[PDB]
Design a protein around this ligand. Structure first.
Ligand SMILES: c1ccc(Cn2cc(-c3c[nH]c4ncc(-c5ccncc5)nc34)cn2)cc1
Length: 332
């Protein structure tokens, strides 16, 4: 143990990396496989949406298997469900993320291009499984080298559902939230993930968030402040009929940017979801022609039969399902 509480076996001499939703996140050492790994410690059993995000990320990441998607190595808990109050997710130790990198470094076009490729390569897998990440942002893209990118945090990950109408349903990180979400186009579409990637590409090009709104109405203010002016929004919230703006050309916002990059950016940051470019079409863009290779882009074996449509479940129940899932990592 230490200070920062935790429990090895089978990992020792850890190190603080920070705290997110629930504590460490600590870089410990592996006794069996002989490496430095990253253990995440979760204590979600006090609320409902907490275990939900815990059970989701566990169920999904175990079934996923891709070079651009973080994997679950080990999960250690108390052998009895009565004592189980903490969960320890063990994952590969990554050096940093795209968020930290963009604070200390201007990325070259070559590096930006391959970073974009790896993200979409990972997204291609996710979407082929009919799954939405819903929370893509630079801090959720882990990096080891320029050629090693891994998507993480699937706590908000839903199975796609374009046909179904979902202050409930929360959240997508504001700066990277697609316009359709804020205008109650309630369907869970794959287009929301592409929007995030668009914002992410825009952020790589200039080391700053393209739409850094304060609140969700200010977010739409920023979005329309670039794309210009385009009503189904039945809140208020209605009075967005304010200063009408013309669409700002990307080459004026990013003058030193590769023209093919800016062209793909325009197609990802499209206001209308139905017009917005899909993941395969994105990879097949002239901007990624030197990397695009379907034979080297593994997709999921089969689309996900639903996330069990689980939202309103008692916490003592999904307590067991986590216990049922994680039972494989017990030595017995
Ligand atoms: C609480 C909850 C969720 C997160 C976000 N999240 C992090 C990982 C992760 C898995 N393995 C890693 N290895 C290294 C690093 C890392 C991060 C920031 N700087 C350096 C290294 N992050 C992860 C998955 N999801 C964070 C805290």
């Amino acid at each position: 143990e230490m200070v920062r509480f935790d429990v090895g076996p089978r990992y020792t001499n850890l190190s603080y990396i920070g705290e997110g939703a629930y504590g460490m996140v600590c870089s410990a050492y592996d006794n069996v496989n002989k490496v430095r790994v990253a253990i995440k410690k979760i204590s979600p059993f006090e609320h409902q949406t907490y275990c939900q995000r815990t059970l989701r990320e566990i169920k999904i990441l175990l079934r996923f298997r891709h070079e651009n998607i973080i994997g679950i190595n080990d999960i250690i808990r108390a052998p009895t469900i009565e004592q189980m109050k903490d969960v320890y997710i063990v994952q590969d130790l990554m050096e940093t993320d795209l968020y930290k990198l963009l604070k200390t470094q201007h990325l070259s076009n070559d590096h930006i291009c391959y970073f974009l490729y790896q993200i979409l390569r990972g997204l291609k897998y996710i979407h082929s499984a009919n799954v939405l990440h819903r929370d893509l942002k630079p801090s959720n893209l882990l990096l080891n080298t320029t050629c090693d990118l891994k998507i993480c945090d699937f706590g908000l990950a839903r199975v796609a559902d374009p046909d179904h109408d979902h202050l409930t349903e929360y959240v997508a990180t504001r700066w990277y939230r697609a316009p359709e979400i804020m205008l109650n186009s309630k369907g869970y579409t794959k287009s929301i993930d592409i929007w995030s990637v668009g914002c992410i590409l825009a952020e790589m090009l200039s080391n700053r968030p393209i739409f850094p709104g304060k609140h969700y109405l200010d977010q739409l203010n920023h979005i329309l402040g670039i794309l210009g002016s385009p009503i189904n929004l039945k809140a208020r919230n209605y009075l967005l009929s304010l200063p009408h703006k013309n669409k700002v050309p990307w080459n004026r916002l990013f003058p030193n940017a590769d023209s093919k990059a800016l062209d793909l950016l325009d197609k990802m940051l499209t206001f209308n979801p139905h017009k917005r470019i899909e993941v395969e079409q994105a990879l097949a863009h002239p901007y990624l022609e030197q990397y695009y290779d379907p034979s080297d882009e593994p997709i999921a074996e089969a689309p996900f039969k639903f996330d069990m449509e689980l939202d309103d479940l008692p916490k003592e129940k999904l307590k067991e399902l986590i216990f049922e899932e994680t039972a494989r990592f017990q030595p017995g």
